Amino acid sequence: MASRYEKEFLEVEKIGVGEFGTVYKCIKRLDGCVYAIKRSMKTFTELSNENSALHEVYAHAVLGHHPHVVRYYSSWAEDDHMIIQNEYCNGGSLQAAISENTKSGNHFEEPKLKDILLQISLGLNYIHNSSMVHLDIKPSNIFICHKVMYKIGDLGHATSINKPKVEEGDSRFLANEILQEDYRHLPKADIFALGLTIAVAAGAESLPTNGAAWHHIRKGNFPDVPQELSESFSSLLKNMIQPDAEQRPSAAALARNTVL
């Protein structure tokens, strides 16, 4: 008479911590595949809006499956702790690949910055076409499979477009339009964060947290990357961080662009 998670899964290793929980690679005993399962470090719960778990729960019931969104399977409770079961991306974070890149002197090259952004753009389009918005796009929440395809994860900041409940994501990928509580075009904030996400993958410095370097970036000023790229590509990238607001390309207008 043990827990659903004990009886159903075999816990292989702990693989990360986030959204107020711990994630473990787990083999499901009955089908023998691998899943990433996040166990809430806290109990149900707090007040809404700024509540991760309700954002995750709402997003997982609105969205279906898409090849570039990390697939959701099941979610349940244990001793008042929430447990989320998602597909297991075996290549880890995109952030982790950039680090092992950076320490080893290498850097993602323009043919790969392009494919990183195209595939994420496809996944971002499915979210927005479901009238949802991610609100925490960064290499931490992009996952690699067969390691090749990138998928978006962490929906602790996700929300409906129509009646939004907004908790701003990571500040280093945060569009100033969101910081000033202008939710007139929320999907464009993921576009903005994606533009910076691709900047991190090209090899840019660790992004600024606040101050003038922050304020400099949100004036359309792309962060410095020790790398030269096509100014046809480089123009598209700065149209993604451009200041305010509806001008930035839609995830569909990005999933069509022959530059990519």
Ligand SMILES: *C(=C)Cn1c(=O)c2cnc(Nc3ccc(N4CCN(C)CC4)cc3)nc2n1-c1cccc(C(C)(C)O)n1
């Ligand atoms: C929600 C449950 C968040 N989430 C996912 O849905 C998935 C899916 N797939 C992964 N894959 C993954 C595999 C392996 C690693 N590591 C390998 C071992 N090294 C030493 C560290 C990295 C990482 C990721 N992960 C998923 N997560 C997930 C995993 C870890 C942290 C997070 C947070 C911080 C909540 O986003 N999410």
